[PDB]
Amino acid sequence: GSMPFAEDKTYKYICRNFSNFCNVDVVEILPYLPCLTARDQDRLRATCTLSGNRDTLWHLFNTLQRRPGWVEYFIAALRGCELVDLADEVASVYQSYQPRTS
């Protein structure tokens, strides 16, 4: 979509609990998260080998936040790698910030 508002707030919200997401696999998320450009995901598949989680995950959120709508696919990213709890975390944010508006 266009104009990230709730999707922008989600970044700032999750940035507060980044430490909870610091226990995730960022590379496993990549094929489960198709809201970015291949280059963006490929970049994460570069930093992954350099750092692992932390730097990769930070750049993950940093690249995600500029894709207005990332949140929805991101739910399916954590949940796609059996990390339903981390999906729940984001889902509970987006449950408040524009959950369903149609």
Side-chain angles (χ1 to χ4, degrees):
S2 299
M3 296 299 300
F5 185 75
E7 322 90 281
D8 182 279
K9 294 185 178 301
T10 304
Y11 173 80
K12 295 175 174 57
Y13 201 109
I14 301 296
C15 184
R16 301 174 52 208
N17 63 94
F18 175 80
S19 309
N20 182 26
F21 286 78
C22 194
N23 192 90
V24 76
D25 193 282
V26 191
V27 298
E28 292 301 278
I29 283 172
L30 304 178
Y32 284 117
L33 184 67
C35 49
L36 298 89
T37 340
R39 187 181 186 188
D40 286 88
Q41 299 299 270
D42 187 89
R43 175 179 176 178
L44 299 173
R45 186 186 60 119
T47 312
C48 61
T49 314
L50 298 181
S51 183
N53 175 272
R54 182 177 180 151
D55 287 272
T56 322
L57 192 77
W58 182 248
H59 286 93
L60 176 72
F61 291 113
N62 183 30
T63 50
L64 270 52
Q65 64 169 330
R66 299 301 70 164
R67 312 297 290 185
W70 62 279
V71 187
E72 305 183 294
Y73 306 98
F74 191 57
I75 306 302
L78 294 305
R79 187 185 58 192
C81 50
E82 284 59 89
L83 301 177
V84 184
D85 291 276
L86 293 176
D88 177 74
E89 290 298 272
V90 187
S92 305
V93 181
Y94 189 74
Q95 194 68 271
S96 187
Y97 303 103
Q98 298 185 90
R100 49 189 56 89
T101 310
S102 187

